[PDB]
RNA sequence: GGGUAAUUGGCGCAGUUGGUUAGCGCGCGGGUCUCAUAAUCCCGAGGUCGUGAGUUCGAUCCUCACAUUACCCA
RNA sequence: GACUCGUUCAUACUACAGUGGAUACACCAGAUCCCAUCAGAACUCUGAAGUUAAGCACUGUAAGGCUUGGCUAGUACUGAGGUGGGAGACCGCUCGGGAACACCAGGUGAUGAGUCAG
RNA sequence: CGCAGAUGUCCAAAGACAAGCUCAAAGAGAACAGAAAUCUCUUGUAGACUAAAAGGGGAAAAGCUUGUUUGAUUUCUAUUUUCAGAACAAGUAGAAAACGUGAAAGCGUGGCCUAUCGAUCCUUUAUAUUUGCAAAAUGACGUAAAUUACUUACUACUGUGCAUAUAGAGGUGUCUGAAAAGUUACCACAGGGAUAACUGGCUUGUGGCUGCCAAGCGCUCCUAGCGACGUAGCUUUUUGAU
RNA sequence: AUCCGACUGUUUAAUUAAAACAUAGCAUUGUGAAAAGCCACAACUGGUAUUAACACAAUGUGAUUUCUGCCCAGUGCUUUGAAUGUCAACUUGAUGAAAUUCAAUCAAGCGCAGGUAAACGGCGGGAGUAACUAUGACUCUCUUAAGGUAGCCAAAUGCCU
RNA sequence: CCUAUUAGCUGGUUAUUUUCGAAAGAUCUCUCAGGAUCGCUGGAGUUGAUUAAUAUAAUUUUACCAGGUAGAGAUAAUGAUUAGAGGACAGGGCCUUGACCUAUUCUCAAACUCCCAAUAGGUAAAAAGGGCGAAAUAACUCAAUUUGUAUUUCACUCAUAUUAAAUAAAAUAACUCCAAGUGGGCCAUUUUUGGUAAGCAGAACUGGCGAUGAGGGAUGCUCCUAACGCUUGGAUAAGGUGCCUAAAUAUUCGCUCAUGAGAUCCCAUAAAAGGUGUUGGUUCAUAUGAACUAGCCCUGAAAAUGGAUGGCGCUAAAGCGGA
RNA sequence: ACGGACCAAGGAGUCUAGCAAAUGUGCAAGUGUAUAUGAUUCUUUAAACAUUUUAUACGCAUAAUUAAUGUAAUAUGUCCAUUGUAGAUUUGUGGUGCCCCACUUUGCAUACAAUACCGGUAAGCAA
C-alpha cells in the first residue's frame, strides 16, 4: 500500500495560533570573536576612565569623613 | 598524481621558520600480538562459542587517500599531510 | 534523486542586465559605512567571493561587524513560527547603503527650524504628517461652448 | 596479508657463474649437390619485466603481469 | 587658445565627409649609453630638421544606433463577489489595478579638482 | 516508477603571483601549394577558450605565452547552507606565526562559482622540559665535604614491555554506519478488504452500433445501392484502467 | 483393436487399489578376520556370528527375445611419492639481562602425474551444387570433451495444432 | 513442570455536572500497520499592565527596495518555419533550376529573451533615544601628545493634554516548568502535473468535513443561510406562496403547443447537421424577390422487474425571460 | 463490516524498587538519631519515650578541574563585601486628582553586557 508523501495544509494555522514570535531587542551583545585590537584598547580606555573615577570617588569620601 | 621528493616549508616542530623537508609515503604497518585489544580478542575466542565478533563483508570503495610523510632536514621531526583520494601516484617523475 | 544545492534555483536571479556586464566601478570602493546603519543586500555575480546565499538576495539589515573588506549584517527571517536573526557574513561588492532611511533623516531636519521658529513667536505648531483626506468645495467656469456630449457607441 | 617459482632475440626457450657473458632451436631472404633434391653449411634483422647506491653482475632495497597451497575482529 | 588626474559610462558609439595648429598635444630625426627583439616595427633611451597628410578638436549627412515624449490603449492581461450566461469550449456584469512590439516627433551631451600660454 | 542529464573522478600544474598579448571566422594577396600546409593586410562584443553534466561569470582578463615559486603550511574564533535551527560535510568573514610574488598599492589557507563523500570499538604511526604501572630502586654514589659509617648537603633531563593524552590514516554505496543461501503441491499461528484472484460502481482507450460533408464507383449519371480524405455521437451483450 | 505393467503378490484404518511398491533375471562395489568389512554404545562391551568369498554387507535395473553406440574436458571416487610447492603441535638453533623475536625439519590433505561412464551426467551452426521444376548424393567454412548411433514417434513425450 | 514464557497484532477497559481543547506536517530510524524528536493542547508559577498609555497587530497609509509569471516578439540574439522579389560560383549551347547577397512576407517555444503587469513580499515612521558644544581616558589609527575613532563626564534642547501617519472588547501580555494525545486523512472554488478518461493518481493558497448539531436543497458526512445554556414576545436570512404544506389560483409585460413539451447552484447527460413552425432584427434589389442573424418549439434521440420535474397535476400556466 | 437470544452475581492502570518536577511541613551551613543500647517500656505496647556521665560512626550538602603525578577561587591596601544600563522600596520639593506626574535620594529580585580569579590546553620564555 502507497500513502501520501508531502502537503504543508494546515501549517500556518498552526504557525499562527501562537502567532509569529520576534526577536528579543536587547541593549547590548557579547564582543567574542569581534574585531581584536579594537576592543582590547576599549579595554585599557575603561580601565583608565574606572581609575579616575574611583580615586575621586574615594578621595570625596576620605576629606568627607575626615 | 605527481609530487616531487623535496619541498621547502613551514616547520611546525622545534624551529618555526621554512626550512628544507624531504617527503615520501607512509604505509600502515603489523600489527603487534601483544597490543591489549588483541590479547582481549584472543581470549575471547577460545572455548567452544565459535566465532565472537563482526566480519565484515560489504566493500565498497575502490581507492585510498594519500597521506604524506614529511622530515625536515635541521631538525630530525616528522609530520603527516593528507591529500584528496587517487587511484595512480607517483613520488618524483618526468614532468609535463 | 532531489538537487538542493547552495547555488540552485539563481539562473535568472544571479545574471547580469542587458548591455550592463563587467566589473564594478571604482567609486564603489569609496562608500562609508559604520556600526548600526542601514544596508542592502545585492549579489554582484561578477564577484565570486564572499557571495551572500540565495534568500538574502535583496533583504534589509543593519550592520555589526566591520574587517578589512567585509562587512556583517543582522536579518531577519521567518522560520514555521516565528523569526530568526541571522548573521550574514559577505564581502564588500555586495554591500549597498540602504535609502529606507531618507524620508525620516529629512523630516527631522526640517521640522527643528519649524519648531524653533514657532517657539520664537510663541506660536502653536503641528508637525504630524497629514493623510490625504476629503476635499473642500469650489465654484467651477465653465463656458457652455465647451462641454462636450458622448453617448454609448455602435458594434463594428 | 604469507610462502614458493617466473619474466633473457619475432615464437619456444637456453644462458645467466661479480674487472667473464648474452646463445640455440624455431621464424624470415641470400651462395649450395640445382632429376621431390628430401636432408643442408656459411651468413644478417634480431634480446636480459624496471629501478640503484658498490663496482662489472642476473647481487641487491620496489612496483608492475601470471601460477600453487594456506590465512582473515575496524 | 591648450594640458594632467577623474565622474556620468553611447545624447558619449559606428560609417563616410568639411574645417584648424602663437604656447601646447602629436606624427617625426637617430641607436653611444639603461633596455629590447627574427626584426630600434613594438618596448627603452638621446634629440629638434619637417608637417597639419593622419591621431586629436569643432561641424555636416531626410545616415544606422542610442535617448526623451506622444500614440498604440483603458487594447492584451489581472485581485475580490456572484443559487451570473452557456451541454460544453469559453464569455459578460459589480468594486478595483493596468502592459508590450510597432509607428510619429524632438535630441546627439553635461560636469569636479589643478595647471600652461596670452 | 514526472521530464532532459550528471557523480564515487582528474591535475607539480590544470595550484600562487606578475608582465606582455588577443581569440573564432571571413575577404583579398604569395614558387612547388591544390577545397585544407606556411606567410603578410583589412574586419572582427567573444560567435573561441576556460579537465569532466548543465547553468552563471570572464577582453590592457578569469583566455594564450613567458618569468619566479610551494599559501595545497601550523593554531584559534564569529558564523551560512540541510535543519531539531543536532552531527558529518561543503563554504564566507577574520586573528597569531613563518613565507612566495610584484617597482609598489596589494594578492595568496588549493582548482572562476554551483557536486566529487563517512560514527563508537579496534589497529597503525607521529608529537611532548605533560603522565602512569599501587611498600620501593634501575642515568649515578653525579658533584662537594667527611670517614673510620646505616655520615651530610645539593641535581629540569633515569631499565625492557605495556597503558594513556592529542593529530592524521585502515569503512561501513541499505552511504546517522547488523558478521548472513534456498525450497514447501505435507504445512502452522497473529492479522489485513490499509492489498491480489468474481458480481456490483465511475470511465469508454479497445470492442460493438448509428450519424454529417462530397472526391470517386455505378457504361452515361455525386446521393437506386454505395461512399475515400476528414469530422459528431450512443451503448455497456468484449477487453482494459482503478 | 490401441496404451501400461511380464505373471501370483502388496499399499495411503476414515475421499486416491493404480501405470505406484515387491518379485525372479541382469550388472556394479567392499572385505582373507578377534589390529578385517558394515552397524550399535557415555564407558565398559556388542549385532551379522551356532558365520567364512557357492559368504556377509552396500547400490542400480526389473520375466523371455533382440540389443546396450560416442565423451574422462567439469564434479566425484581411486593409485604411485622424499624428484617435488604449500601445509600444525612438538623439537632444534641464533640473538638477548630475561619475557620475547627470528630461522630450520620426510605427518596426513591439496597440488603435481595416471585410471574409471551398468559413477553424477553430456551427445552443434552457415553457404553453394545434378540435361524443365523441386531436392541435394557432392563441395567450402566456423566450431566442441564428444557433436544424438541402432532404433522409435503429433506416443501418458509436438508450442505452432 | 520451566511458565501467568514472548507478541510493533485483534477484542474489552465500570458515577455526575462544569471549564479549556487537538493532530493526521516535519527530521532520523533493518524504517513504511512501529518508535524517538519538533510542532499543535492542558495544568502549575513568576514578572508585567490596570494611567482610553506604551509594549503589540495574518490591516491600511507615506518613503524606499527586490523580481522575470500572465502578456508581447519573431524586421532584436538562440532554436524552429511558408513564399515570392531584386541584385552580382554549379548548369543544357544568350536563356533552366540553383548557389551567394540585399530588403520583405505566413506561422511558433516548460527546459528562448530587447520589454514587462495584477497579486504576493521586505525595511523605516524619535526619549535606555536624537541634535549641538566643551573636557577627560587609550597599549588602536594617522605624517599628526590631535588626525580620527570608541567609551566616559558636564552644559544647552527635541512634538505630546489630541498622543513625531490612520485604526484597534491592544496586557486575554511576556517568560519558565511538568506532561497527555497525534504523526493512515479526505472534500470544495481558483492555479496545476501524468493519463483517452475516471466517484483515477500527485502538488499550491484559503475555507471546511473529520470532532457539529439547527432552517433550506423531496432524499444525501463536505452545497446555501447560520454555528448551539432554559424561556416569553417581536422582526428576518436561505428559500418559497395551486393541493400535499405555513404564506398570492397576486398585480403588470412579452414568448411557447410538443402522436415521448417544460419546470433554476453542487445535481444527478446530450452533439455535429437540419426545419416553407412561429417571433423579432440587419442588408440588398419596383411590392413582390432574396440573403443572413437569434429566441421558444421540432428532427437527429435504441435495453433489459413497473415508475417517477419528490407526487397529484398544470396550457386566460401552477411553463420560460423580466418588473 | 464484525460482537450482542434473555436475567442475576463476578470482571480490568495496581504493588515494590530507584530518579525527577510540583506543592505542604520542620530545622538551616548544616541536616538525617543507621545498626544497636537504656528505661519504675510491657493486655493494648510489634506502639510510644530516651541517647553513652573546645564532644572526630556513616550518607547527602558545604568546591572545582584534569587520563594523570596533582593543583585549587579579587588580596592586606580595607570587617571590607568588582563595574555599568533598566528596575521594586525609601528620602526631600512642586503639579493635577493615599494615587499618578517632574525634579531629587536609595538601588531588592532579575535581564543584558564588562572585568578579575581557579583547573585543563595552545603560545612566548624557561633552573
Ligand atoms: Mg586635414
Ligand atoms: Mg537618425
Ligand atoms: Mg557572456
Ligand atoms: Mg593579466
Ligand atoms: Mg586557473
Ligand atoms: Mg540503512
Ligand atoms: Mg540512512
Ligand atoms: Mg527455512
Ligand atoms: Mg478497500
Ligand atoms: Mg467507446
Ligand atoms: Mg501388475
Ligand atoms: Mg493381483
Ligand atoms: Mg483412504
Ligand atoms: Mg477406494
Ligand atoms: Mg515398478
Ligand atoms: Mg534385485
Ligand atoms: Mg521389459
Ligand atoms: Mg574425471
Ligand atoms: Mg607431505
Ligand atoms: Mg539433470
Ligand atoms: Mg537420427
Ligand atoms: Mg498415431
Ligand atoms: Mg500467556
Ligand atoms: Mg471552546
Ligand atoms: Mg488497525
Ligand atoms: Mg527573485
Ligand atoms: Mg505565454
Ligand atoms: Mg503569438
Ligand atoms: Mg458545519
Ligand atoms: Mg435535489
Ligand atoms: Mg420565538
Ligand atoms: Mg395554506
Ligand atoms: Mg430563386
Ligand atoms: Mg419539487
Ligand atoms: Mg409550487
Ligand atoms: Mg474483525
Ligand atoms: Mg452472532
Ligand atoms: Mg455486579
Ligand atoms: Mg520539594
Ligand atoms: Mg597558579
Ligand atoms: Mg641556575
Ligand atoms: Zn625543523
Given at each position: 500500500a502507497k500513502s501520501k508523501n508531502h502537503t504543508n495544509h494546515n501549517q500556518n494555522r498552526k504557525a499562527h495560533k501562537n502567532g509569529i514570535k520576534k526577536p528579543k531587542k536587547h541593549k547590548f551583545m557579547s564582543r567574542k570573536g569581534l574585531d581584536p585590537n579594537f576592543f582590547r584598547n576599549q579595554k585599557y580606555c575603561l580601565k583608565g576612565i574606572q581609575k579616575k573615577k574611583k580615586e575621586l570617588k574615594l578621595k570625596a569620601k576620605q576629606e568627607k569623613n575626615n | 598524481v605527481n609530487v616531487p621528493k623535496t619541498r621547502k616549508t613551514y616547520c611546525s616542530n622545534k624551529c618555526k621558520k621554512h626550512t628544507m623537508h624531504k617527503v615520501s609515503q607512509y604505509k600502515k604497518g603489523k600489527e603487534r600480538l601483544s597490543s591489549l585489544g588483541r590479547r582481549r580478542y584472543d581470549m575471547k575466542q577460545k572455548?567452544?562459542?565459535?566465532?565472537t565478533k563482526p566480519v565484515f563483508k560489504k566493500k565498497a570503495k575502490t581507492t585510498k587517500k594519500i597521506v604524506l610523510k614529511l622530515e625536515c632536514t635541521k631538525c630530525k621531526k616528522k609530520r603527516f599531510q593528507t591529500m584528496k583520494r587517487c587511484k595512480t601516484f607517483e613520488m618524483g617523475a618526468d614532468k609535463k | 534523486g532531489k538537487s538542493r544545492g547552495?547555488?540552485?534555483?539563481?539562473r535568472y536571479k544571479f545574471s547580469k542586465k542587458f548591455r550592463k556586464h563587467g566589473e564594478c566601478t571604482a567609486n564603489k570602493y569609496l562608500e562609508k559605512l559604520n556600526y548600526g546603519d542601514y544596508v542592502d543586500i545585492v549579489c554582484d555575480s561578477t564577484q565570486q567571493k564572499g557571495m551572500p546565499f540565495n534568500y538574502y538576495h535583496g533583504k534589509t539589515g543593519k550592520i555589526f561587524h566591520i574587517t578589512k573588506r567585509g562587512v556583517g549584517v543582522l536579518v531577519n527571517k521567518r522560520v514555521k513560527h516565528r523569526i530568526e536573526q541571522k548573521k550574514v557574513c559577505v564581502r564588500i561588492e555586495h554591500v549597498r547603503k540602504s535609502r529606507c532611511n531618507e524620508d525620516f533623516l529629512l523630516r527631522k531636519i526640517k521640522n527643528a527650524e519649524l519648531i524653533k521658529e514657532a517657539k520664537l513667536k510663541n506660536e502653536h505648531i503641528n508637525i504630524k504628517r497629514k493623510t490625504e483626506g476629503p476635499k473642500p468645495a469650489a465654484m467651477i467656469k465653465v463656458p457652455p461652448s465647451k462641454i462636450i456630449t458622448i453617448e454609448p457607441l455602435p458594434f463594428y
Open positions: - | 572455548g567452544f562459542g565459535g566465532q | 547552495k547555488r540552485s534555483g539563481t
